[PDB]
Design a protein around this ligand. Structure first.
Ligand code: HEM
Length: 368
């Protein structure tokens, strides 16, 4: 593609200048390669996410079938999605976030204390993955299987891995632990209007992944951005900016979710362009969060930025249910790293070849 090649190596290295030019010339752009419109402005992406009747997550409505193991909260829209959405909302909000912050603070400190002895380690493998996997298993209230403690099978073999995970989920539902999102789901299911069928099981799988790979990649993106921005780490070290506001700026700046796809169900004009029923639109929210029309000086990392109405947690009917867990994870991680002021890069990052959910596979670091 002449404008946007998401898996081009030079593009993966830094997509944001490519997003900017695309936004500047064709903010609503038809991409033949991806068979989708590409919206790079905050206003357009917000509209895409706030009208399920016009832009749907259920691609069956444009006659694309859903693999049965993928029909879930994520791939349904109201009214189909609604009982599940509310059940998940209810089980999440029943959790004690103060207790979660307390135990994650201890875990982050002991992780980095052990990694302080190294002179160079991969922040991704040794902290981001370990920390987020601990958080999501404790939050859901399940134990890692001894034969696959890293859940490595679950990152046809894909069909077999989904069926194995579904087997695990059903055993959890049948014998829930003493706390967490899943035991509260079990408690709340009678009278929720949700059936304990395959859609529920698939939804637990989707919840796990939403609460694992996504925050893990954010934590790596965020630290990489701080290390690569002159003065940004030292600003945190000095207490010059608050962590809450810094975390929201880091989500805006390098939040992992790059693309949210929707199916167009009614003709619509956007940026002058006539999007047609049956076509796919892609809200490039990574680009939208650097849209100058919404954020002044958007390509500059401003840890004190206020206001900051970023799209990093989505909008509307499918907005992120774990966003306050994500914020606790980031806040805890930064405070824990800040106990080791000499943190510095220790080699080059390498980017995962992923244009949809952006992250690093390696982030060489030392704590000093
Ligand atoms: C920095 C971390 C995170 C970011 C940036 C993030 C971002 C997002 C975004 C953009 C969406 C919208 C998806 C869409 O519109 O199709 C979403 C949905 C969702 N997120 Fe998060 N998320 C994060 C962490 C988490 C965590 C930790 C959990 C669970 C503990 C979680 C649970 C969910 C769920 C269940 C949904 C689906 C909601 C639905 O489809 O109705 N997320 N997330």
């Amino acid at each position: 593609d002449p404008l946007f090649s998401p898996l081009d190596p030079a593009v993966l290295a830094d997509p944001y200048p490519v997003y900017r030019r695309l936004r500047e010339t064709h903010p609503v752009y038809w991409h033949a390669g991806l068979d989708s419109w590409l919206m790079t402005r905050h206003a357009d992406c917000t509209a895409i996410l706030r009208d399920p009747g016009r832009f749907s997550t259920d691609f069956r409505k444009i006659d694309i079938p859903t693999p049965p193991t993928l029909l879930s909260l994520q791939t349904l829209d109201p009214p189909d999605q609604t009982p599940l959405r509310h059940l998940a909302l209810d089980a999440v909000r029943a959790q004690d976030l103060d207790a979660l912050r307390k135990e994650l603070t201890l875990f982050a400190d002991q992780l980095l204390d052990e990694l302080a002895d190294r002179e160079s380690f991969d922040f991704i493998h040794d902290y981001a993955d370990v920390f987020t996997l601990r958080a999501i298993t404790r939050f859901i209230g399940v134990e890692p299987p001894e034969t696959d403690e890293a859940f490595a099978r679950f990152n046809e073999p894909g069909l077999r891995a989904r069926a194995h995970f579904n087997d695990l989920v059903r055993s959890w539902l049948g014998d829930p632990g003493p706390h967490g999102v899943l035991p509260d789901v079990v408690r709340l299911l009678p009278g929720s209007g949700v059936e304990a069928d395959d859609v529920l099981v698939n939804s637990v799988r989707a919840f796990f992944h939403a609460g694992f790979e996504v925050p893990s990649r954010f934590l790596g993106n965020a630290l990489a951005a701080l290390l690569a921005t002159p003065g940004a780490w030292e600003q945190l070290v000095r207490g010059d900016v608050g962590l809450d506001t810094a975390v929201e700026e880091l989500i805006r700046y390098v939040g992992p979710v790059q693309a949210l796809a929707r199916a167009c169900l009614q003709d619509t004009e956007l940026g002058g362009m006539a999007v047609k029923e049956g076509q796919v639109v892609t809200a490039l929210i990574g680009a939208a969060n650097r849209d100058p029309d919404q954020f002044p000086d958007p390509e500059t990392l401003r840890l004190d930025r206020k206001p900051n109405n970023h799209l990093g947690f989505g909008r509307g009917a499918h907005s992120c249910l774990g966003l306050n867990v994500a914020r606790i994870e980031a806040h805890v991680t930064l405070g824990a790293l800040l106990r080791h002021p000499g943190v510095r890069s220790a080699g080059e990052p390498v980017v995962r070849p992923n244009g949809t959910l952006r992250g690093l596979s390696r982030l060489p670091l030392t704590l000093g």
